């Protein structure tokens, strides 16, 4: 009998996949769950289910966390007065703006169809403002810039794939989570393009 399978099938993978974020915490919690499960067979499953039953609360929070990811945070802001750099600041502003409003448009087919078109445009236009700004840096010193462009392109694909799954699923949290990652990424674009400049 395995009332204990979910420890290994859910919790272990969950901790394993969070090791790069923090290692020690992943380890201490694994150990905590293992000890709890051995003293109390079936406890991990009961815990997992009680988390899954809080789906509403967790959706509401993830919405808030996304809505808040936008507003101009006093850190990432390129000081350079050049037109190319300024165009970058604002195209990122527009993308972060549009991605942050997803929570309040997703529950309407028509409006969300418009939003998807605008997000696509906002991404493309940011890609243009990143491409236009390359010339401002010494061409033998763009490793970080190029690398950060690729990573942004990866997470943009990732968001597009997430958005594709939504129409088959209907599960909005994936979209929200993916959209928040993308915001974090456009921030890293701003961070990278500010450090080399």
């Amino acid at each position: 009998s395995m009332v204990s399978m979910p420890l290994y099938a859910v919790m272990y993978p969950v901790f394993n996949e969070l090791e790069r974020v923090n290692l020690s915490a992943a380890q201490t919690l694994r150990a905590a769950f293992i000890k709890a499960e051995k003293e109390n067979p079936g406890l991990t499953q009961d815990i997992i289910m009680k988390i899954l039953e809080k789906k509403s609360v967790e959706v509401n929070f993830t919405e808030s966390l996304l809505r808040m990811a936008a507003d101009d945070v006093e850190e990432y802001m390129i000081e350079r007065p050049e037109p190319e750099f300024q165009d970058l600041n604002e195209k990122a502003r527009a993308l972060k703006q549009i991605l942050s409003k997803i929570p309040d448009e997703i529950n309407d087919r028509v409006r969300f169809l418009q939003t998807i078109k605008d997000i696509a445009s906002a991404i493309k236009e940011l890609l243009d403002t990143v491409n236009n700004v390359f010339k401002k840096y010494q061409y033998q010193n763009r490793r970080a810039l190029e690398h950060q462009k690729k990573e942004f392109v990866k997470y943009s694909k990732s968001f597009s794939d997430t958005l594709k799954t939504y129409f088959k699923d209907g599960k909005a949290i994936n979209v929200f989570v993916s959209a928040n990652r993308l915001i974090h990424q456009t921030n890293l674009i701003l961070q990278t393009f500010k450090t080399v400049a």
């Binding site: 696509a120 943009s156 597009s160 594709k164």
Partner: peptide, 11 residues
């Protein structure tokens, strides 16, 4: 169509 339009410009 807009779903594919993103992937093309990203690739």
């Amino acid at each position: 169509s807009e779903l594919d339009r993103l992937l093309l410009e990203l690739n």
